[PDB]
């Protein structure tokens, strides 16, 4: 599942 | 039959800086909030970015419909030559897609890119791959550090192919 | 300080430029230095224009004329971007140089820009029928007129500065 970077 | 490129940063440099780059150099970049994905040069969506679970990926925030739907249808530094603009591109990653799968995208879609996180990003000039670089963060200022790079001579030749 | 809390902002009517490009053309440094009036630059006619603010795309648009001015008709608003605004001698001669033909540009407040919608007609400054600005490296270097022969569109140089001044622009 997508973990958001930045 | 279609390639989705995700640019991480565009770095405007002069030819002389290009030819003087060496491994270990860190190139300052703007913290990329958004990421615009392109297809043969043309923006088709904006998106946030991250991983899933070990691959880099985009979380689509906005599709640029009209474009998507139309896809469906040895020389001193004083020298002026040394000051010529060369755009340096850092790609977050790419993915090959069918127009169909592309048009099936919507806000929220998570598109994985063909590269593992933590492995160095591609760096290109004039669309040709000339180096690898890794993202570096120090006190929230971002940068790309050159890990590997072709010779200044090959840079010069790939630029003017 | 414990200040911005109770604070009422003055009207700050600072402006942006919306730029609309007719064509981008890859050329080589030699070709840039040897360009002369009468020369014709082959361009595929654009089915639409992506308008930029400071090099960032903000909208797609159709184009044409209104009040004898070049103009855009807003096709599509790239909303997040808009909302965020609101918040070896022969190698050398082969060096690529992007030459840009510019349909026109206008100054807008962010308020004006955020009010645009599918439909909005935006007039560009500079009159229709007068020649188009030609730039390299973001500097004016030439003027051009859109031409046709068969289904072949081109931009023919009407005016252009000296090669010395072109070389200079390029490196500025």
Numbering used by the authors:
A (entry chain C): 128 to 133
B (entry chain A): 18 to 90, 140 to 227
C (entry chain B): 4 to 90, 143 to 227
Article excerpt on this structure:
Type III secretion systems (T3SS) allow the transport of protein substrates directly across the double membrane of Gram-negative bacteria. Proteomic analyses have identified the major components of the sorting platform for the Salmonella typhimurium SPI-1 injectisome: the AAA+ ATPase InvC, its regulator OrgB and the proteins SpaO and OrgA4. Here we show that a novel, heterotypic interaction between SPOA domains serves as a scaffold for sorting platform assembly in both injectisome and flagellar T3SS. Our structures suggest a partial model for the subtype-specific assembly of the T3SS sorting platforms: the heterotypic interaction between SPOA domains within a given T3SS subtype functions as an adaptor for ATPase and its regulator through interaction with the APAR peptide.
The SpaO homologues FliM and FliN are predicted to contain one SPOA domain each, which we designate as SPOA1 and SPOA2, respectively. While complexes of FliM and FliN were stable, they were resistant to crystallization. Interestingly, FliM and FliN can be fused and still support flagellin secretion and some swarming motility. We crystallized the SPOA of FliM (residues 245–334) fused to FliN(5–137), and its structure was solved to 2.56 Å. Architecturally, the FliM(SPOA1)–FliN(SPOA2) interaction is similar to that of SpaO (2.28 Å r.m.s.d.), with the exception of additional helices present at the carboxy terminus of each SPOA, as observed in FliN homodimers from Thermotoga maritima. The similarity of these structures is consistent with the SPOA heterotypic interaction being generalizable across T3SS subtypes. In the context of our FliM–FliN structure, this suggests a model for FliM–FliN interaction similar to that of SpaO. FliM(SPOA1) would engage FliN(SPOA2) in a heterotypic SPOA–SPOA interaction, and additional homodimeric FliN would interact with FliM–FliN in an as of yet undetermined fashion (analogous to the SpaO SPOA2 homodimer interaction with full-length SpaO).
